Amino acid sequence: HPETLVKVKDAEDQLGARVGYIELDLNSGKILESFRPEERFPMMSTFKVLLCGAVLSRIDAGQEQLGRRIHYSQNDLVEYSPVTEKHLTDGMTVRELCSAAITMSDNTAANLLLTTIGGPKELTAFLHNMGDHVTRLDRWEPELNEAIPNDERDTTMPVAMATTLRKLLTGELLTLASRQQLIDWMEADKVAGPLLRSALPAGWFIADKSGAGERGSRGIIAALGPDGKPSRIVVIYTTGSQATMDERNRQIAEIGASLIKHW
């Protein structure tokens, strides 16, 4: 609805920075509304959904197992690792590391899963093969959150990320048991409370993943809908603001409120 675009322009005024937005129909793939849809923004932790999408494809092909245990040491720990730092003695399984990376945004869990698939270059190759020639991962955690002006490393576009998430959740690429496992991890997200979930009505469904980084970067990807089922995808990114985290969280929640009011 054009009234949601009045609110997106007002968030750019308030934050003094660019905002990229798209609303996509899940069944047909039709673009319902957009603002800067083909400009590049840093992905930050929203890449962790794509990483566990690639791990599940290897599991379907018989090349990896959910129950395999990974051992690591204190030398591997980087900043913001709330789950992995509590399990140094006995390690964690592939299932437990994808749960930590998506529901808690754990940074060491994502670096350990990147090593098992062959690094940034192999995730970008997996994306290219399913038709996404735009999204690219180049570095490991925490450097991928730098957000240097005009740099193309570790970036996506709103329309590229939205059509890749539709394919991962409804297409023939993963088996039905694996698509549902990825949806279950996103539904159990624990760290995105002040963003779209604060505007959601009773009875509605949401599965999502947030991200934050340097130079005011903040973003969210989501599948949501009435009566307990998903029916649209929403992607929102911003970078360059000098405002506080609470001021960035509030403008994303108010774009969410408009979108719901005009559904």
Side-chain angles (χ1 to χ4, degrees):
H1 192 290
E3 293 290 336
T4 300
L5 297 186
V6 166
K7 181 57 228 175
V8 179
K9 189 259 176 178
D10 182 63
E12 300 213 327
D13 283 334
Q14 295 264 278
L15 295 182
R18 299 180 298 131
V19 174
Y21 172 78
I22 192 150
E23 188 181 16
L24 197 104
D25 187 70
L26 185 64
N27 182 236
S28 75
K30 182 187 174 286
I31 293 168
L32 304 181
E33 212 59 82
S34 68
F35 192 90
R36 304 183 191 275
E38 297 176 43
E39 293 194 27
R40 283 184 182 273
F41 292 85
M43 289 190 274
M44 308 152 301
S45 291
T46 62
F47 91 92
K48 289 169 189 166
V49 173
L50 302 191
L51 177 63
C52 282
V55 170
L56 287 170
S57 163
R58 291 180 97 247
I59 287 168
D60 286 348
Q63 308 182 261
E64 179 56 272
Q65 301 94 262
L66 280 174
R68 191 174 68 90
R69 183 167 290 279
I70 291 169
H71 298 100
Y72 54 97
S73 76
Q74 73 300 346
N75 308 315
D76 295 298
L77 293 178
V78 300
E79 57 192 78
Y80 194 70
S81 298
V83 184
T84 42
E85 69 186 5
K86 291 161 80 296
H87 291 263
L88 284 173
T89 309
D90 297 297
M92 293 177 65
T93 58
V94 175
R95 173 190 284 112
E96 290 158 10
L97 288 164
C98 267
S99 181
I102 287 172
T103 72
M104 293 298 296
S105 239
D106 194 297
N107 281 164
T108 300
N111 283 355
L112 297 167
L113 293 160
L114 276 169
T115 301
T116 69
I117 71 162
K121 291 274 193 191
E122 286 302 306
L123 181 61
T124 299
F126 168 81
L127 263 18
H128 189 92
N129 270 90
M130 62 171 274
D132 185 337
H133 294 9
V134 173
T135 307
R136 50 183 291 182
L137 195 72
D138 297 87
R139 289 179 287 173
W140 300 67
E141 288 284 2
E143 291 76 22
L144 65 88
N145 303 110
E146 259 190 325
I148 296 171
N150 307 312
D151 188 0
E152 290 183 7
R153 290 181 288 180
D154 307 301
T155 58
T156 190
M157 293 175 178
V159 72
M161 175 57 85
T163 56
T164 292
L165 188 64
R166 182 183 172 258
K167 290 169 183 179
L168 234 31
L169 303 183
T170 66
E172 291 180 358
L173 187 50
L174 302 171
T175 58
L176 190 273
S178 293
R179 286 177 236 149
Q180 190 56 42
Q181 180 54 91
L182 183 61
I183 283 158
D184 288 348
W185 285 325
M186 293 181 74
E187 189 181 19
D189 188 9
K190 302 293 189 279
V191 296
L195 301 170
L196 291 183
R197 290 167 183 263
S198 67
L200 199 78
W204 283 45
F205 171 95
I206 187 162
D208 62 4
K209 178 72 200 83
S210 54
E214 292 188 55
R215 301 178 188 259
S217 304
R218 190 72 172 118
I220 185 155
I221 61 184
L224 80 169
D227 305 299
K229 313 186 295 174
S231 61
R232 305 185 188 173
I233 285 170
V234 171
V235 174
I236 304 170
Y237 289 110
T238 184
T239 194
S241 186
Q242 289 173 79
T244 62
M245 185 68 68
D246 290 331
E247 289 177 287
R248 275 174 288 141
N249 290 350
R250 284 181 219 120
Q251 292 297 315
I252 291 170
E254 291 293 345
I255 293 173
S258 192
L259 178 270
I260 298 292
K261 182 181 181 188
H262 297 293
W263 194 269

